[PDB]
Amino acid sequence: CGADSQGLVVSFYTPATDGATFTAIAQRCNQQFGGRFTIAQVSLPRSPNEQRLQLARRLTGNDRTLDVMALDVVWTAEFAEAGWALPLSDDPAGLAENDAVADTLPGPLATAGWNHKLYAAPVTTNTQLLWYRPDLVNSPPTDWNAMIAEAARLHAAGEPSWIAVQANQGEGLVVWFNTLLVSAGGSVLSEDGRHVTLTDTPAHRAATVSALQILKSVATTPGADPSITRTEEGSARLAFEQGKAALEVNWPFVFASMLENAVKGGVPFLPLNRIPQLAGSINDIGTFTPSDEQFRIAYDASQQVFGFAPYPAVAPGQPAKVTIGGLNLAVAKTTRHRAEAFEAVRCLRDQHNQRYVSLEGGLPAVRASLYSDPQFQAKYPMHAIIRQQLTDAAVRPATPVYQALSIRLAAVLSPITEIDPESTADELAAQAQKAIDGMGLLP
Amino acid sequence: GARRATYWAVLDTLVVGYALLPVLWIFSLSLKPTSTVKDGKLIPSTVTFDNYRGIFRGDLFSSALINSIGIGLITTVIAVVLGAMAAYAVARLEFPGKRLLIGAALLITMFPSISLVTPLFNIERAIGLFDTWPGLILPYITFALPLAIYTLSAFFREIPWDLEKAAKMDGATPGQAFRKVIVPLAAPGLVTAAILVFIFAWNDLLLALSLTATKAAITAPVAIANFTGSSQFEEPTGSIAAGAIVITIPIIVFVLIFQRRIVAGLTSGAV
Amino acid sequence: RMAERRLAFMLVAPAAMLMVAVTAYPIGYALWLSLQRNNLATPNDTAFIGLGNYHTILIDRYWWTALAVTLAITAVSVTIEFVLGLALALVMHRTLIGKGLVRTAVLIPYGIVTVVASYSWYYAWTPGTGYLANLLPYDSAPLTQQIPSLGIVVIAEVWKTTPFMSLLLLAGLALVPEDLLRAAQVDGASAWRRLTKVILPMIKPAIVVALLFRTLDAFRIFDNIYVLTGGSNNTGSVSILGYDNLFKGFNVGLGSAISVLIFGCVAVIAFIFIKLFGAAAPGG
Amino acid sequence: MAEIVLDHVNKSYPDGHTAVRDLNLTIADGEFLILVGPSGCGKTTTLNMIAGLEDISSGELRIAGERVNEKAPKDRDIAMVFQSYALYPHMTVRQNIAFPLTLAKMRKADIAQKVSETAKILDLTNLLDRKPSQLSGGQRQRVAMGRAIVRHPKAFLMDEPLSNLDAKLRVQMRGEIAQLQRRLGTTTVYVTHDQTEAMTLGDRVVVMYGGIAQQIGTPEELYERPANLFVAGFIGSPAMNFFPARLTAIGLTLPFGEVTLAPEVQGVIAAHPKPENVIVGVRPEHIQDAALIDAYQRIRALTFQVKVNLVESLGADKYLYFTTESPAVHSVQLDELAEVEGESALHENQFVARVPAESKVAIGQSVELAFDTARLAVFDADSGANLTIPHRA
Amino acid sequence: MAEIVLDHVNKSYPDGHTAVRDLNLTIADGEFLILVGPSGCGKTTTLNMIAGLEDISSGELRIAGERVNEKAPKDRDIAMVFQSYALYPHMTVRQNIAFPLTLAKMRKADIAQKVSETAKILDLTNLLDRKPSQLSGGQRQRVAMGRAIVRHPKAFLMDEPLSNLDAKLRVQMRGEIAQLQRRLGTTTVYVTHDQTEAMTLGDRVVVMYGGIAQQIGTPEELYERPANLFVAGFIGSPAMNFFPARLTAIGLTLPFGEVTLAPEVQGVIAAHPKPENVIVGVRPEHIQDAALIDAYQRIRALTFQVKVNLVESLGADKYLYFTTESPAVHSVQLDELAEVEGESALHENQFVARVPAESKVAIGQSVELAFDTARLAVFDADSGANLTIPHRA
Ligand SMILES: OC[C@H]1O[C@H](O[C@H]2O[C@H](CO)[C@@H](O)[C@H](O)[C@H]2O)[C@H](O)[C@@H](O)[C@@H]1O
Structure with missing residues (x-):
């Protein structure tokens, strides 16, 4: 020593x-x-x-x-x-x-x-997926309007009616807005970051307005999450696993979390603790680590109170373009x-x-x-x-000044509930222009 | 005996509740099992020390408590040393500019720490002491030394200086007086200013957060500010609560030990 | 006379020298950086701008929003802290059964870490697990709205920084001889006219000094805002502004102008408190 | 203004210290009654029980029959002067005096009028606008008195307001306080520790000790007739020379011969319970050099010879400590009166004589003196009361 | 212990303020010399100069014959006692008084022994282990005495040691002080202000005023023959009663007639240049009530009546305050002292008659004054000096 x-x-x-x-x-x-x-x-x-x-x-x-x-x-x-x-x-x-x-x-x-x-x-x-409770819902939405319809339907029946999306003022909100905008036939910057291409083309303006309208229609709906404007990856995953939500949009890392946290207790709608075949199936440091068939047991068990589906599109015709x-x-x-x-x-x-x-x-x-x-x-x-x-994923602008642009975007979309599409769409352009020129001071 | 007793009892139990509720709350959170941690029960049920077990398993908090303690000691030592040699000179001598000096020692104590992080970062990134103990001790004196000067100047003015002439009248060697009669009259002031400066060292987050990088120089408030929970998939509330309790108990028991000196020092002389 | 002169000029020499070198040098360095287009990402190419870094701040908006938030927080929290600290120093001074106990209780929040308290208040206002959040009308979530979040921050600030102010006030209180209180009581002090008529006008210097400390310390509020909200949704103080424009924008040339303006404004606050209201040092 | 009634009022602590035990006395209107006694003997306890600042253990205090045990001090209409001057430094002396008037919600114009009047009574015209720091101790005491008088209360409660100043200022302001009280003719309860204060001013004096008012009488009455031995040793300056002796059917066995007593005083001392030893006391002004007094005094005086060890020119008279042939006095109660000063009984067997400074007898020269025998202070062995006064009932 | 001879010590304050003026005095050994006076009159000033704390511009002083105008206080071997009691709280009593012995490089054994002995002298062996805080103020004074006695210096400087004690405590303790000084025969300087301590302990009482030593010598010389009005007023309990008068060569023209005294006093007055105004002084102890004493001694005295305003009952004696229709006592030396009293012109020329108890003069009644013809002194209001004593250059 x-x-x-x-x-x-x-x-x-x-x-x-x-x-x-x-x-x-x-x-x-x-x-x-x-x-x-x-x-x-x-x-x-x-x-x-x-x-x-x-x-x-x-x-x-x-x-x-x-x-x-x-x-x-x-x-x-x-x-x-x-x-x-x-x-x-x-x-x-x-x-x-x-x-x-x-x-x-x-x-x-x-x-x-x-x-x-x-x-x-x-x-x-x-890339994000759509996770749902197949015991409550059936035939997952596969469309955002269908998502909100199913949410209202579950709320009318007094059920977990949260949508559990990432909506904080971080990058998880700019990612979602970019997914929506590009899947609606738009883009933030040009192919090379040189001038904001957000609301110059009438088609582009329609796309960004549709994206903003979807963002506003979520988070302002009966039975929505009260603290929706403070959620990110971990918060959404946890709020789903507790049983407060029946739908969520989250990255694939939520499946391992589901299984492990269910075996370690936690998840009430999936005990997985009263099964002696799962005894000792938790590593001494916390990780799950099934043997080879403990996985099959704990997965076939969850296959009926858990499930996934591709990301929901914007218009029912074309598929989505996940970021x-x-x-x-x-x-x-x-x-x-x-x-x-x-x-x-x-x-x-x-x-x-x-x-x-x-x-x-x-x-x-x-x-x-x-x-x-x-x-x-x-x-x-x-x-x-x-x-x-x-x-067919939708990449981000990929410019040297990107992370200075996403801050402006998230700042002007910071409260989702306080969004109105027509003015916010025209207001995004000035902030994107300032981020391109590196003027002003970011929040 | 009848009225006043119950009056003061029910009046000063309110302050006990006031002071202890935000602590008992988090301590109860820290014992709830990871399943029931999400119900608003103020009093837990079937408590488990699993959170503290997961906190102890690891080395993140030891290697930060040690940094905080060491930096506190090395700061307060030089603060008291360079501040006593001024407080003694400000309470006994009459140089031109005394009121300006004491006003500065009063103001700079509560300096806006944001006005420092930009030039300090731009300097320490270029000199070499970015993530080091001196890189933190050097800014910390801006808040330590003025506080030490203020406290010791307040305390020294309460010394019966006439004892100087007394010793001059029954003894000899003004140096021997300065050594034998006023030094025992000035030791407790140093012992108390040390505690005050040390306690004051802990409550900084901006500088210790923007001028430290790794385990070599991360303090306790920075260590807990970046904490996220023992495991990566369990609910982090109980783990964060247990970590907070563990990281805050030492300075709490220190303050509880030295309460008398602390209240005698902040209230300068009084009580 | 010359002896003590050349003695002071050598005893306050290292103190003043170190204080200058460690405080006045970074301020001058900030002032000199505040004139350049100095950016962290592109270090080699920095050009002397002029006043193009104060224009782009005084004309901006996030600057004024943060300044206004900081001023509102400071005023409200300081007023409530003063009231609570006086009401607490009184109890700590005139209690009868247990005084060591109440002193210990008051000190507990004083020595606590200023971040674990913010965690406590953060988990108290979280719906479902927060015993305070479970009292509001269902589906409230006050940590998302701006003004309720500011209210929570003010509550945390008050709870944390009352004991210090209460001790500062008890300092100037313990020098009020009880015979004066008895004479007032005899002459007809209502136990309120007592306070507002003899006790407050007698402890005015201690009051003003405690006010100066609390104002200059609440003007640099960083921690409760950083933990409870993180500055998102326009609830960011003037410290969050610099801490973000230095480390997220990498712009030193104006991350330093922000520091210069903050220094100038706290200097204005200090000038007010010093020239008006007296606020002299306790040494007299 | 109104007589103050006492109904077995006492002060006892649950912690064990009993300050007062069931005192009953009525303070006559306008009388300059004064409380005197040693430190902590219950004086301040009684005063603060009156002022309501101290809780009454039991009993009932009545201002001419008014229930005041539960009355708030602000609702008793009393005033007092604290020896610490109880002054407010922030407000000027004018505002100081006006303060209780301000609390009285009186008209500010007539308030200032009353302040001007009472200040001109005290000649503080140029001081009312000053600060207590800008004033002298006598001026501050005058300010305190002026603050106490303007209220016209039921009674005044003074508390040695001249204890902490010069002696000449003390005596002149003492005369001035007497004049002001008599002009105002209001009840005042003066509390102090010195007896001379009461002796020069008190319309009546009440000696206090440990919750027992040993006597209630006038200064001249306390001077002529010490009701007991504690008052004899405590009242008078200096105390009367003490002599031990045993009972005699015709008088007492003085260490300098046989002392005869009159038939009436013999009868009254016989009426008391017969003691084994008697305590004799004579005041220094009585003991005088026999070389200057007429023989008409010596027919009742017992002359004797005595040498001196202490000589000094004390102005007109000379307090002359002498090496005398008189042993120490012993009594069951004299012990509690002995250790008051610390150098007790070290000059015993050497007593003092107040004689005029005309005589030139210095140390070593034994001078023959004589004093009247009937001027003795007699005390019981167990009660210590003046046996020339019969045991009351 | 060693002689102390002063020689024209002079100052230079940075302000030029005059605190000393040509002091010359031999402070003899075994004597108890006392410096008494008001504030700023130089007592503390000259005492510090004795300790060498204040430096002179010019002058000379020798202890044991050697010049000490530059000798350090650590060197002159003199013990001073401080009114602040100058106690070190970090040392116990025995350590507190052993401190100077340990400083003087003595032996641990004999240091501790001498400490025990000097404590026995003050009976402090009972509490040799305590701390200065947890003992009473008189005991703090006793510890000051302990520090004083031990070192056996060449002189003592007991500066106002009784300032904070009480009357009886201070009188018994100053008796102890005087007898202890005699036991040790040490040259002391008891810098005080009260006249009692001054005249009851002083072998050569020295009075001061603004840097002028008015009268220097035994208390009796100043007491009977005050050099001028300053000592006549500052000394006396109460001061000598001053009567203004008009110049006469066969007597003195009082506002109530001519006083028939012996003519050689008038010759002594005429020896000087004739003054313009004169004041006549007689101590209260000389004035008696003619209703008690016949005109036997008053055959030569100038008798008249005065209106009594206040009467005082003392017991052995009686005091009456009386104002007459005589001009207000105005003198150049008294006008310099006018800034002291505070209650001016209310009872000007109102004097007191030190009369025994048998005098029963009524209040308000105009009564004649009985007093010895020669007990009054002649001093002019112009020069202020007592013309009863000739002007010696
Ligand atoms: O929300 C913006 C980012 O989200 C993803 O990253 C988060 O999710 C991962 C889990 O799948 C974590 O590993 C990672 O720490 C989180 O930041 C995505 O991978 C990023 O590209 C997005 O920028």
Whole structure:
């Protein structure tokens, strides 16, 4: 004691929403390295709009401990220009610029390259689904107007009648508004961020007005969530699992949470504790970890008080265009072990750790090969819907000034209940213009 | 005996309730099992120490309590040392500009901490002490040293200075007087100003939140501000409550131990 | 005389030197940064602007909204804190059965961490699990509306910072000799004319000093707003404004102008309290 | 203004300290009655029980039959002067005096008129607009008295308002207080610790001790007839020289010869329970050098010889402590009167004689003196009362 | 213990204010010399100068023959007692008084022994372990005495040690002080202001005024023969009764006739340049009631009547306040003292008659005054000095 000397410790920075899974990933990865070094996971805040704050504070403050960061899927176009998140092209081993594109899906990979040069390696991806209680509702809506109709129908019968959407002033609201706008045939910025294309075309104005009208029609309806304007991912997932809601729109990571939290107690409408076949089926640290058939038991049991369905469209004719999201792994510029970091990155994302994160953390893997395995398809039932939704997904503007634009958007849509479509649509344009020109001061 | 007794009893139980309700509330939250934690029961039912178990399993709060305590001590030591050598000079000497000095020592104490974080960040990112103990001790003196000067200047003016001439009249060596008669008359003032400055060190969040990055320099209020719960899928209310209780009990028992000195110090001389 | 002169000029030399180097230097640095287009994302290219960083603030809107919110919070919370602190110092001074007990009770909120209290108040107003939220008419959720959230913040601020003000007031109170209270009682003090006629005009300096502390400390409110609401929905004080425009916008050139304006306005507050109302130091 | 009735009023604590035990006395209208006694003997306790600031244990106090045990001090219409001057520093002396009038909701013009009147009674015209800091101790005391007089209350309750000033200011303001009270003719209950104050002013004096008013009488009456030994040792300055002796059918066995007594005083001392030892007291003004007095005094005086150890020029008279042939006095109650000062009985066997400064007898020179024998203060062995007065009932 | 000879010590205040003027006096050994006077008259000033706390511009002073105009207070070996009692709260009683011994580098054993002995001198061995706070103020004075006695210095400076005590306490304690000083034969300077302590303990009482030593010597010389009006007024209980008069070479022209005295006094008056106005002084103790004493001694006295305003009953003596139709006592030396009293011109020329108890003069009645012819002194209102004593350059 007194002087605990050890090898290098590559510091890994992942959001807290999925800390306990990337911790086990790091544990599995600290075996294929022997004694060369070790990886240590460190948690970032749970909200996307402040994960960037922490990362940028550490990067600009020359924090020499920041080694590997799992950054959001919309920040590359900014961290690359700002000098941070050094490009894949200069790994002293010369392996990342081709390990990244080996088996990655074609969608998420397009979010890393900024000027055709890659600056990060995709580690996971996301897309929202529709989760419902099949015992209460039947034939899930598959349309937003149908969603609200079913909500009113359940409220008339004195039932859980919340819709459980993400509506805070964060990025989860801009994501939803972007999904609606693009699925209605619109877009915030031009193909290249140069001038706001929100409300210049009459068709574009109609699209943004329809999106705003859907946003306002939700959150102002009988039996709605009272604190709807303070909800995000965790809050929506929890408010659904309690039994307060019968519908929700949330990322796929809610299925593993459902199963694990039901086995650990919690969920009242699915006991799963009085089944001695599930005894000892909780790891000593909390995770679920079924054996091989405990999963079948606890999944066939939940298959009748839980279910999912593709994202609800806007008009009943055309399908939806769900906004893509995920995490990319990048190596910070304030790193002295700029080789071990690039080694640990490619050792973090491989055909076993991807399988592990997707089968015990809900996070959709990005290795395009995994979605063709039978067993993985049998322990990840929403794989087909995820693959389908990822095909025609609607990406975000991807400009260097994006995160300064999403703040303006979320600020002018901050209270959803206090929305009126015609003025708010014309008001979004001025704020988007200011964000493009970087004028004024953000809230 | 009859009226006044019950009068004061029912009057001063109200303040006990006032002070203890926002604490008993969170403490009861901290014991509710993760299932029943969502009902508005003020009194729990079938309490479980599982939240505290999950808090103790881990190392996030030890390595932050230690940082807070160490930074507090290293700050208050130099604060008291550099503040006594001024308070003694402000309560006994008449240099030109005394009222200005005491006014400054009064005002800068409640400095707007937001006016500092921009230049301090822009300086410490470029000198090298971004996430370090000195990088925090250096801004903290802006609030420690004025408070120490104020407190010790208030206390020193209550010293029977005539004892100086007394010792000069029955002894010798004004240095020996300064060493043997006023130093025992000035030790408790230092012992109390130390407690005051130390307690005052804890209530900062903006600077410790915007100038610290990792486990090497994160304090307690920053550690609890970024906490989210032991597990990643369970309801975080009970876990956050237990973490808060655990992170706040030490300074609470410290204040309870030193209550007498604290009330004698803040109320300068009185009580 | 020269002896004590050159003694003071050497005893208050390190104190003043350190205070200058650690306070007046960052302020001047902020003032010099407040004139440039200094951005964190693009460090190498910073150009001397002029006054183009105060124009874009004084003409903006989020600035005035935050200033107004801060002033309202400060005024209301300080008034309520003064009333409660006086009513509490009285009890702590004239109690009869247990005084150590009431003193301990009052100190408990004083030494508590200013964030766990905000967590307590945050979970008290959450519907379903908040024993306060379960009293309002169903489907209230007051943490979403602006004014109810400001009210909750004020409640938390009062509960946290009463004990300090009550002790400050009991300081100036314990120097009121009880014989004066007895003489007033004999002459016909109604136990209210007593207070408003002898006790308050006698402790005016302590009152004004406590007011100065509480005003300058509530003007920098950051923590309860950061925890309870986070500044979203226009309930963000003037500190949240700078903390966001520095770390989310990376704009140092105006994140520093905000600090300069905050310094100027707290200096105006200090000038008011000092010139008018006296607010002299206790040393006299 | 109105007589103050006492119905077995007492002060006893549940913590054990009993301050008063069932006192009954009526304060005559206009009389300058004064309370005197040692520290903590119940004086301030009685005064604050009157003022209602102190809770009454039991009994009933009546202002001519008015229920005031439950009455609020603001609703008793009383006034008082606190020795701490009880002054309000923030308000000027004019506002100080006007304060109780302000509480009286009287007309501000007539309020200022009354203030001007009462201040001109005290000659404080240029001080009313000043602050107490800008005034002298005598001026502050005058301010306090003026604040107490303007109310025209049922009675005044003064509390040694001249205790903490110079002696000359003390005596002149004492005369002035006598003049002001007599001119005003209102009931005043003066409380103090010194006997001379009462002796110079009191229309009547009441000695207090531990809740027992040992006597209720006039200053001259306390001077001529100490009702007991405690009053003899406490009232008078200095106390009368004390001598021990045993009972004699014709007088007492003085250490300087046989003292004979008149038949009437012999009868009255016989009427008291016969003591084993008697305590004899003679005042220093009685004991005088026999070298200057006529023989007509010596027929009743017992002359004797005595040497002196203490000599001083004390102005017109000389208080002369002498090495005398007189042992220490012993009595069951004299012990509680001994340890008052600390240097007790160290100058015993050496008593003082108030003699004119004309004589030049210095230390070592034994001078033959004589004093009247009937001027003795006699005390019982157990009761210690003046046996020249028969035991009352 | 060692002689203390003053020689024309002079000041230079930064303000130039004159606090001292050519002080010359040998403070002899074994004596108890007392400096008495009002505020700012220099007692504390010259006492600090004795302690060397205040520095001179010019002048000389020697203790044991050696110059001490520059010697440090730590060096002169003099013990001073402070009115603030100058007690160190962090030291126990025995430690508090041993402190100077430990400072003087003595032996732990003999230090503790001498502490025990000096405590026995003050009977403080009963509470040698306590702290200064938890004992009474008189006991604090006793601890001051303990610190004084131990070091055995060359002189004592007991500055107003009885300021905070009570009357009886202070008289017995100053008797103790005088007898202890005699026991130790130490040269003391009892800087006080009260005349009782001044004249009952002083071997050479020195009075001060604005930096002028009016009269220096035994209390009896000043008492019978006041050098001028300042000592005549500041000394006396009450002061000498002043009667203005008109100049006469065969007597003095009083507002009520001529007083027939011996002519050599008039010759002494004529020895000086003739003054314009004169005042006549007679102490209250010299005036008696002619209704009790015949005109035997009054055959040469100038007799007249005065209107009595107040009467005082003292017991052994009687006091009457009486105002006559004589001009107000106005003098240049009395006008400098006019700023002291506060209640001016109400009872000007109202004097008191120190008469025994048998005098029963009624109030308000105009009665003649009986007093010895020669007990009055002649002092002119112009120079203020007593013309009864010749002007010696
Ligand atoms: O699936 C769990 C993740 O959800 C959040 O991230 C998603 O939501 C963000 C905005 O609401 C998107 O920007 C992001 O692309 C999505 O992945 C959460 O921020 C993550 O920490 C969770 O891992």
